[PDB]
Amino acid sequence: IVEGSDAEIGMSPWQVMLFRKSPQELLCGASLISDRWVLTAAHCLLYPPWDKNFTENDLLVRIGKHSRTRYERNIEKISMLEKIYIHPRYNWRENLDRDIALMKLKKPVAFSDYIHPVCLPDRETAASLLQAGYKGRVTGWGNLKETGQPSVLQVVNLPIVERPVCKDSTRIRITDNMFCAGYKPDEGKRGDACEGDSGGPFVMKSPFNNRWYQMGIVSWGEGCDRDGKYGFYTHVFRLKKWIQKVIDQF
């Protein structure tokens, strides 16, 4: 996360860290939505241009973390995966459309003051909150600059941007399954997610019922925090029917 701050303890109890077993490295962010399911971006796992095609046995999911590099004994939990599901229509070939993947944990995790799931939005919440100008929050242990990595979880609050503006900031084709967020050069505020933050959650807090809903998944962006560019996020609600299907079928 670029131009963000250190999160507070228990600020994002649904944040998950996808860790590789060999080498042992931070792969991406993800979120806990159930005691058994984790949501992430599909390019964190499959991205053929760079030969990434990770399987269950190559990953560990660490939940309850704050510190990036330390094993927070008695606080964090590490789970193994049973299955990984990538959206059958994830478009890695062109613009990472439907960049979403679900992972089933081997065993349920128990909630604590540092581990708790985030809610997934319903048509109404999506409608009233996914409006340009409204701010969401992204969290992660990814790069701090484009070209180092933080000691603890970082947070940055960014506004959603009007679709026309997103389309006009790039050559890439934006679909209705994505939304963009970030500040305009003439706003005087910065911030963005960066490499290492993909897969993590873009959440908003409902003013009606005070719950945090995950509206997006950090997907791509051209560089990190460049002026005139924005970060793109997978639109969770548009892909919720797929999410449901996988969870009440497997």
Binding site: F19, K21, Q24, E25, L26, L60, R62, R68, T69, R70, Y71, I78, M80, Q149
Partner: peptide, 11 residues
């Protein structure tokens, strides 16, 4: 720079 975690999670 990651710290080692319990062998029981590599398996």
């Amino acid at each position: 720079d990651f710290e080692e975690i319990p062998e029981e999670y590599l398996q």
